Structure formats: C-alpha cells, structure tokens
Symmetry: D2
Subunit: 118 residues, 4 copies
C-alpha cells in the first residue's frame, strides 16, 4: 500500500506510514541528515473498489534543526497500486513574503513517486 | 497567531492548533458532525520578523464516519498577522480516479481565511 | 461584454477585444515583475456561452517580450467572464520562465487575478 | 525557433502550430484521428528572442472548446517551455476552466500537465 519508501523523479526520498486513522506521517528528503524534514498528511483509508486510485495529500514545512527556507510544499495526488505502484501528485510551494511580493509567492509542479530510485 | 477558529469566503470553518513542534492539527467543516473532517499539516515555527508571512499547509481527506468523497484537498499558503489577520491559500483537490480519467482528477482554486466570519 | 478595458487587483491594465470568431486580442500592462509598458496578448473565448446563468470561459497568453524588455517568460490566464452590474473576469494563472533542465522544477508560478471594468 | 510544426502529447492529442516572427502562435488542436469534429482553433504567444545560455523558450496558448460542431463551454491554457534538440519537447502545465454559475465557481478549474514531442 502507501506505507513504505518512495522516490520522486528527481531523487527525493519520501518515507511514509499510512496509519489506520487516515494519517500520513514520516520524513521527506529533498541525501544527508540535514536535508530531512517532517511531513504530515491524510489519505482515504477506505478507497473505492472500482479500480480507482486512493486520494491523499501531505505537507512539508522547510524548517529543520539545520535550515529554514521560510516556505512549505503541499503534494496532492493519488496512489495507484499494481505491479509497479505509483503515487502521482501535483504540488504547491508557498514562501513567506511581504504583501507586495505575495503575487509571486507560490510555485507549482508535478512529482511522480515509485518504490525504485530513478 | 495561527491557533484558533478561521472562516473562509464560502462559509467553511477551519479549527486549528499550531503546536510548538510545527504541527497543525484540527478539524475542517462546511455545522454537524456529518460535515466535519480531520486535518493535519505543518507550519514554519520560526518565521522571519521582517513583515513576511508565515508559510504553512494542511490536508483534508474527505472521509469521516458518515461520508466519503474519495478525494483530498491540500491548502498551501501563508498566515499574515495584524489587525485584520488572514490566511491566504491556494488549493489542490485530487479525486481517486481510474487511469483513463486521471487527466481530470485535480481541481485548483484559492481560499482566504479570516478570524471573523 | 468582454471587449473593454479591465484592471486587476494589483493595478495591471488589460485592454481586450472579443471578436465574433472567438478571438481575444489586445494589450496587457503589468504593475509587477520584470515588465514595462504594453505587451501583446492573444487568446480565445467561448463565443456562444450557455444560457443557464453560467459565465463565459476564456483564456489568453502574454509573452513578456516587447521593444523595451524581455523577461524570458510567459503568463497564461484561464478563467470566466461573469456579467452583471459589477462585471468581472475571474482567473487563475500560470507564469512559466525559460530555464535550464536542472532549474525546470521551479520554472512555474501560480496565482489568481480578478478583473473589473472599474479600477480598484 | 524549432516550434513550427506538428506536436503530439502523451494521450493522443495533436496540434499543428506556426510560430510567427513576431511571437505569435497560431494553429489547430485536435485528436489523433483528426476528424473535423475534434479540431479547434489555438492561439498564443512565445518568446521570439530566447536566452542563449541553454534555457528553454517560454510560451503559452489557449484553446476554447467550441468549434462548428460542438461546444463544451470551457477553455484550456497551456503554459510551458520549448526545449530543442534531437529529442525536442514542449513541457507544459495547463488550466481548464469551465463556464459555471457562481455557486459552482469554486470547482470550475482543472489543473494538469502535458508533454509534447515531434513523434507520435
Ligand atoms: C534546503 O531546502 C530544501 O531542501 C527545499 C527548499 N524549498 C523547497 C524544496 C522542495 C523539494 C520539493 C520536491 O521534492 N517536490 C516539490 C517541491 C519541492 O520543494 C526543498
Ligand atoms: C461531502 O463532501 C464534502 O464535504 C467535500 C467534498 N469534496 C471537496 C470538498 C471541499 C471543500 C473545500 C474547501 O473549503 N476549499 C477547497 C477545496 C474544498 O473541497 C468538500
Ligand atoms: C517570473 O515572472 C516574470 O518574469 C514576469 C515579468 N513581467 C510580468 C510578469 C507578470 C505580471 C502578471 C500579472 O499581472 N498577473 C499574473 C502574472 C503576472 O506576471 C511576470
Ligand atoms: C473534443 O474535446 C473536448 O470536447 C474537450 C473538452 N474539454 C477539454 C478538453 C481537453 C483536451 C485537453 C488536452 O489535450 N490537454 C489538457 C487539457 C485538455 O482539455 C477537450
């Protein structure tokens, strides 16, 4: 299922546990200790039984004991099981800004995760 | 300044606690238990003190003990303090779909939250 | 109707003509970013919208190059026109810069602009 | 510029575009089979003087989903960059806005990504 270690297309490492209560918990590394960050999120713990994927999302605030970028990324997507399981996401990365700079505060993109290094 | 009850522009209520460890926890509703959902997220617990906002994000999966939309929303944004404090966000709402329908799986929008409804 | 001069919430000026064939043409002047004076825009709109109270779907693009500056970037606005006593165009936008492959992951900004014929 | 010609996305769609000397994109967006009912006008803009440091070329375009045969009351904008070479690509993110009532406007806009190649 969702619980496990995943890698995006750029080599980031997503170590996640999907709990019985719909919770996602774990760590995100965008490969050393000072690049590891806490993540939390939620997933559909009772997905449809018609072949559909499992909706999920999570957040990382880019502060740890070593760095603080004053920013946070959310990933929104779905887990697709099968022979090569995949989590397909789109993401929003918002930085803290002044009001005058808020129009350019948010980047957008897409990440795909597999259980194998790219 | 984040902990408390917040209201978006469409009548939803966002009840959140910002913990010392950077955690966001709480509930999201659009007023009975049937419409209330768990949320979890993260925020910058050491923001700049130069007028910049506080970056944050959270997720709701749209399942509770009564309903399940097989979907989840993530909000990404910043808290802005002051006399009219706000949480300004953009959001992504992904539904569980088949592969053939995955191209249309994700809605995008924006929500602004205030401390008074 | 869509044809007219519009302003967003940040002071940008959007001067547009909606042609009978579905074409949007005109100029955009931005109050933010690496921008000066007017830039060409082109786009499309639904020339036969639904009659059930729905807005009119539309979109347009500005490449941020003119005779004065070139930011090596382009914005697309996607949205709908909503008529009424306070006519409005509500949009969400994507702004992509030309980048190297190593920097492409952070090539695209996203936001939302609302346009009115009265300048806020 | 390398942009003019026929491009194919990952899901069976095709577009033929001309990149004008002035920065104009004009052409037609269609399905793989190419029947008349699947063809729509496309219009956009690109950076006609891109950087020379290995960066991509920023561009965008719009298709309103109305033709002489059908009308979905919606429009898509693609925002992205062209990357040249033997394996040329246009890498995009897109926004698809439908005309809606105010009460349904919150769910009016879909978001995704498309990659285009010169080979089907
Ligand atoms: C030291 O700073 C960081 O590691 C850092 C800062 N700011 C953003 C990101 C990051 C990583 C990442 C990703 O894997 N997918 C989508 C977005 C995204 O953003 C990482
Ligand atoms: C019964 O189903 C629901 O309550 C439900 C289902 N699917 C989505 C949403 C919802 C609410 C909401 C919001 O306040 N801001 C952004 C997105 C968003 O999505 C609610
Ligand atoms: C990275 O951004 C640029 O290079 C840039 C240059 N010049 C103008 C703009 C600009 C202006 C503008 C607006 O009014 N609404 C939405 C997006 C947007 O982007 C962006
Ligand atoms: C015949 O086609 C339609 O009626 C139609 C209606 N509504 C949307 C689309 C469409 C096609 C398409 C795409 O190739 N990439 C991204 C978005 C996208 O949207 C097509």
């Amino acid at each position: 299922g969702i619980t496990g270690t995943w890698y995006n297309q750029l080599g980031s490492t997503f170590i996640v546990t999907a709990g019985a209560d719909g919770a996602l918990t774990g760590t995100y590394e965008s490969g050393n200790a000072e690049s590891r960050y806490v993540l939390t999120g939620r997933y559909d713990s009772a997905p449809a039984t018609d072949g559909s994927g499992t909706a999920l999302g999570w957040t990382v605030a880019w502060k740890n004991n070593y760095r603080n970028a004053h920013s946070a990324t959310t990933w929104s997507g779905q887990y697709v099981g099968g022979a090569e399981a995949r989590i397909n996401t789109q993401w929003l990365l918002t930085s803290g800004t002044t009001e005058a700079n808020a129009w350019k505060s948010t980047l957008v993109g897409h990440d795909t995760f597999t259980k194998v290094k790219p």
